[PDB]
Amino acid sequence: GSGMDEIVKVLSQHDRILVVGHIMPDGDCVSSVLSLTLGLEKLGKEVKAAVDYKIPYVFEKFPYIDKIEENPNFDPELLVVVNASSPDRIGKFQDLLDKVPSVVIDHHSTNTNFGNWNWVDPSFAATAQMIFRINKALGVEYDSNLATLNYLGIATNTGFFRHSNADVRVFEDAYKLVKMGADAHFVAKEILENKRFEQFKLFAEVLERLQLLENGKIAYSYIDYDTYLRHNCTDEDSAGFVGELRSIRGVEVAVLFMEFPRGKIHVSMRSKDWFNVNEVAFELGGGGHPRAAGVTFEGKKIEEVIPRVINHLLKKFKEGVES
Amino acid sequence: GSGMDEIVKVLSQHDRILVVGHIMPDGDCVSSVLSLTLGLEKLGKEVKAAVDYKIPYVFEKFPYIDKIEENPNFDPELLVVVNASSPDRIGKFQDLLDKVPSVVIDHHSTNTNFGNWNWVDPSFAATAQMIFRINKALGVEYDSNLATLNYLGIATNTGFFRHSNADVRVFEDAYKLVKMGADAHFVAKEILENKRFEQFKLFAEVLERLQLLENGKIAYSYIDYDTYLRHNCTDEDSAGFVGELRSIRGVEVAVLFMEFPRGKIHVSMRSKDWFNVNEVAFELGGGGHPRAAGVTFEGKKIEEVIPRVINHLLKKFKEGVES
Ligand SMILES: Nc1ncnc2c1ncn2[C@@H]1O[C@H](COP(=O)(O)O)[C@@H](O)[C@H]1O
Ligand SMILES: Nc1ncnc2c1ncn2[C@@H]1O[C@H](COP(=O)(O)O)[C@@H](O)[C@H]1O
Ligand SMILES: [Cl-]
Ligand SMILES: [Cl-]
Numbered sequence A, B: 001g002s003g004m005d006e007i008v009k010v011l012s013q014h015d016r017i018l019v020v021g022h023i024m025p026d027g028d029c030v031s032s033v034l035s036l037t038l039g040l041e042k043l044g045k046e047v048k049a050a051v052d053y054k055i056p057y058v059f060e061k062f063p064y065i066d067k068i069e070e071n072p073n074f075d076p077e078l079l080v081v082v083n084a085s086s087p088d089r090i091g092k093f094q095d096l097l098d099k100v101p102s103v104v105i106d107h108h109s110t111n112t113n114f115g116n117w118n119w120v121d122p123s124f125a126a127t128a129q130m131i132f133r134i135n136k137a138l139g140v141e142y143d144s145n146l147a148t149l150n151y152l153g154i155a156t157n158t159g160f161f162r163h164s165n166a167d168v169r170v171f172e173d174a175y176k177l178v179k180m181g182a183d184a185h186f187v188a189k190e191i192l193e194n195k196r197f198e199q200f201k202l203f204a205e206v207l208e209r210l211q212l213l214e215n216g217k218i219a220y221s222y223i224d225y226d227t228y229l230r231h232n233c234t235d236e237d238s239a240g241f242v243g244e245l246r247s248i249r250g251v252e253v254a255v256l257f258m259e260f261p262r263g264k265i266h267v268s269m270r271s272k273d274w275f276n277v278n279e280v281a282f283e284l285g286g287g288g289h290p291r292a293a294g295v296t297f298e299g300k301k302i303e304e305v306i307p308r309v310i311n312h313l314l315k316k317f318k319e320g321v322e323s
């Protein structure tokens, strides 16, 4: 397993670079892609950024968001894949893995190490923190826009400094980026204050279906595909719903089952204090973090997935309570 | 107007000190009261902490919360009032202002300077930041519990680093406190993840009454007293509701009218980008910050307050749009 130094050397050695993020991009993906792309351009390299997916609405006002292309026309010397744990997550760009030397930079412990060089460090809360250190190691000078873009992923992946991954290194990075001009309020406003009215109606559906188990310590609900369509919503609109269920008093584990598209059931799990949802996720074929993890089923009825997941969660939860 | 140095000298000169916060205490009040009380105790002083109000549920697990007394039995040499902008806000302890020398420490620009010594600095987002600097100036050594307690007010008064008052000094303070052991995740979990089910039902009432004006740029709603009672709620339960209305896409100003107790109408105002709600608040007899401000009426029908406030807000908003 390569460290940062070997990645920095490899980046220094190539001058035509395609930086690729994952489908369904989140703040850390957008942050890592644009921060590395702009950093490498400041070294004079020829760099393009690509994500095989529509950029979500909340990113449309960020500086340089138009640098991320869905259909780049580029012949790179080097592929750099950021924040994507497996080749399927980069969509049509996985075809380049067979033709172009590749670097992987990722904080996900689930990363399959599919690059020729791989720097994977789960002690970071965000891949953006790794890009920050790469850019500094390369000699990149930050301006306010680059600082804002690199702050983005650290904020989003820690829930804006609320989750258990917000450790001293996260706060140090945020401080350094704000000192360099990162507009923390701009980032919060664009990410968190662009709610659709339909999102309130969709969450009302979640609350109607909400079920508590184990003396209120487990909360789960679901959104079926017809309900997304009924409210002109996609799974972009239910971002943050599972954390709202975790925020209920006395809840330790929250699970949200989301069918989107039809027959594709994503299970999002969150815990509050002590329960390791990643162990449940892993055993079901997914993965993630001790306090935030997920599983994705293809080709299943939601009526089959829900009781199987709840069954496994109850067994594990009862074991944990017994210590 | 005294600065920090004169306050530090005055604190150093007295050894029996009552630290008082304001009624309806928030995170900054609890943070400032306990951080200063514990800091002064580490200098060996005899210190009590007092708030003439029930401590809200979300603070009950914080370390040393039991140090805040509703009914202290103490004869202080010095009264220190933190985060309270006027004597009425400290309840029954305003009687001590006539008998005991008093120090005021506050970030609110509305502070009436009712102490014998007053350090009021609106450039701080939180009074807790001023207490942090006082404690360091006095030579206090932070442990993890004191760091957690001092972090609390900086986090709550910036919306956990989301609001426009989260400047480089806020992030520096947060970093320094987390480096000293502040448990940022504990604070977020206790403050933000203790929601009552009744709070979701109460917010559904807010959404039912929600009205948009000026091409969706103004949003307002209201909670009358009977509606609070119907949902076993008080105005503690509607904390954060007005920010949820601000978070609607395209909204620039959000206003929530809250009747609690009967006939007492509190108007909470939030803006997003540019509109100065403090100017509207001030003209109506309240005050606050450019992006968060309020007004409180006693003895009025909500049917009278709502159109008068909306009228003034519309006039000011239309003027601002014309630049
Ligand atoms: N099917 C899956 N396999 C592996 N990791 C997954 C996963 N679904 C989610 N995760 C990870 O778990 C965390 C929580 O995911 P989510 O926000 O979708 O609940 C994220 O960091 C995400 O990358
Ligand atoms: N009636 C009033 N007079 C002066 N300042 C007020 C006020 N009501 C609220 N504020 C201030 O305005 C900000 C927003 O108040 P609120 O959270 O109640 O909306 C807070 O910092 C608060 O101290
Ligand atoms: Cl731009
Ligand atoms: Cl992990």
Ligand SMILES: [Cl-]
Binding pocket: B062, B063, B064, B065
């Ligand atoms: Cl204690």
Ligand SMILES: [Cl-]
Binding pocket: B109, B122, B288, B289, B290
């Ligand atoms: Cl101000």
